[PDB]
């Protein structure tokens, strides 16, 4: 019974805490990355104009 609860804890700790952390930490990074790519390209267009 104790082994089940220890295992249950880790299943829950991973399913509710660890994975969702990863899931949109990823989502955050990918959108921050695309945010900057689009920022840099807008910079270079102005620099070409000047």
């Amino acid at each position: 019974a104790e082994e089940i609860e220890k295992t249950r804890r880790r299943v829950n700790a991973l399913e509710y805490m660890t994975i969702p952390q990863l899931e949109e930490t990823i989502y955050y990074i990918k959108m921050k990355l695309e945010e900057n790519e689009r920022a840099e390209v807008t910079r270079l267009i102005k620099v070409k104009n000047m």
């Binding site: 220890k6 804890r9 880790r10 805490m17 620099v47 000047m50």
Partner: protein, 455 residues
């Protein structure tokens, strides 16, 4: 002869362009005589042909181009320095703000100053007891060091800065610190906290204050720290004082630079910040230390708030690349009730080796520091590994490290903003916490010290 032109070509934001102009030098101080007779000081940013670009400190609100004139003073932005500045309070340009007597300048100084010859430098190694254990032991501040505080909005960095100023002293000496305080775009309450604190300790009579508040023109913030540092270097090297400089908020300074930068339509670096942010910041922070043959010294403690609490932001990242370490405050420790909220792990002092040890603090300073650091990192690791997997999930020796980490934060780091620990107390306290760890785990301390100090 007064050099003045009535030929302003264009006015855009803080920038002004003057045409049909002669004999004007780069970085020359200028005065705009607006049509209403109001005077607004400025500075030549760029000179080409018969044209001059100038930045107006007070801004260009309500300016008529035809009926305004620009005076060129034939010298860079200077500060009238005097020992009479002690106990006085000035605004962002060094002009009196406390409604007192007129300062009679001993001499005038280019607020840009001059780079100290690296051979002329005297290596700063005099231990400053701040009273804060997280600093004095683990991130030791020495006299002449640039050691900033990395904070965030809503964090108690003003409390830390004031405590350091109240308790800073070297050992075996009756010396004190002449305090040069620079306020950069900070609010009234942020400013009055320091004002009231300096009065309740009488430090106000050992201090010089340059105040640029949140309602002051943003461009003034560029001159402001150079004013303070020029006052500091003067008092230190020409008046033999040990000067403690405190500048906040350094973030506001950087964002002022970017304003001008953006206004000039300069080629933007990261987040609009110019490509010369590192160089520009360095010309402020490298203005500190000791000089061979001279009795004075400049100790810089800049304060910046990390935007979005991210120290990979240009402002804290570049600062960290310049200053000799940093004192980082985390929001997590602040909520925990830690005073001061110093996270020793990402904190650093690059001048702690030659400042501590036998004759400076104690023979066991370096050893216990490295051992507390190692145990705290391991203990904090275990703490987070127990909050997510339970107390029963962790090794028996690691729970000890977890009990250590908690006790280290609540009893060693957390000491209060009005507590002045002697280095001897701090070190003895450190050994107290090492005693709760097995002797076999203290692998960074040699058996010389363990037999002598470990209870």
């Amino acid at each position: 002869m007064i050099k003045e032109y009535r030929t302003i070509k264009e006015v855009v934001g803080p920038l002004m362009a003057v045409e049909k102009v002669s004999g004007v030098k780069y970085e020359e101080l200028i005065e705009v005589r607006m049509q209403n007779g109001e005077i607004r000081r400025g500075q030549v940013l760029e000179v080409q042909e018969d044209k001059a670009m100038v930045q107006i400190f007070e801004g260009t609100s309500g300016i008529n181009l035809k009926n305004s004139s620009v005076r060129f003073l034939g010298h860079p932005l200077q500060l009238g320095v005097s020992e009479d500045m002690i106990g006085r309070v000035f605004d962002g340009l060094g002009r009196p703000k406390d409604n007192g007597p007129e300062i009679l300048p001993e001499k005038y100084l280019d607020i840009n100053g001059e780079v100290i010859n690296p051979i002329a430098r005297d290596y700063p190694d005099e231990f400053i007891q701040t009273g804060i254990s997280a600093i004095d032991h683990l991130n030791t501040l020495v006299r002449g060091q640039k050691l900033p505080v990395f904070s965030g909005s809503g964090l108690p960095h003003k409390e830390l800065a004031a405590q350091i100023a109240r308790q800073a002293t070297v050992l075996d000496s009756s010396d004190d610190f002449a305090v040069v305080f620079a306020a950069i775009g900070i609010t009234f309450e942020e400013a009055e906290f320091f004002m009231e604190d300096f009065r309740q300790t009488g430090a106000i009579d050992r201090s010089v204050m340059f105040m640029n508040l949140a309602n002051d023109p943003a461009i003034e913030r560029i001159a402001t720290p150079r004013m303070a540092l020029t006052a500091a270097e003067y008092l230190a090297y020409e008046k033999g004082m040990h000067v403690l400089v405190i500048m906040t908020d350094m973030t506001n300074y950087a964002e002022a630079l970017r304003e001008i930068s953006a206004a000039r339509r300069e080629v933007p670096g990261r987040r609009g910040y110019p490509g010369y942010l590192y160089t520009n910041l360095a010309t402020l922070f490298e203005r500190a230390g000791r000089i061979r043959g001279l009795k004075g010294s400049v100790t810089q403690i800049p304060i910046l708030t990390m935007p979005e609490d991210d120290k990979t932001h240009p402002i804290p990242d570049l600062t960290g690349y310049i200053t000799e370490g940093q004192i980082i405050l985390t929001r997590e420790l602040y909520k925990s009730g830690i005073q001061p909220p110093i996270d020793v792990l990402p904190s650093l002092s690059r001048l702690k080796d030659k400042g501590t040890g036998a004759g400076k603090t104690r023979e066991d300073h370096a050893a216990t520091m490295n051992q507390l650091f190692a145990a705290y990192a391991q203990g904090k690791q275990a703490k987070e590994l127990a909050v997510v997997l339970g107390e029963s999930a962790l090794s028996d020796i690691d729970k000890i490290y977890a009990k250590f980490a908690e006790r280290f934060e609540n009893e060693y780091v957390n000491q209060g903003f009005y507590t002045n620990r002697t280095i001897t107390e701090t070190l003895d306290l450190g050994w107290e916490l090492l005693a709760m760890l097995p002797r076999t785990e203290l692998k960074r301390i040699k058996d010389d010290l363990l037999d002598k100090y470990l209870p």
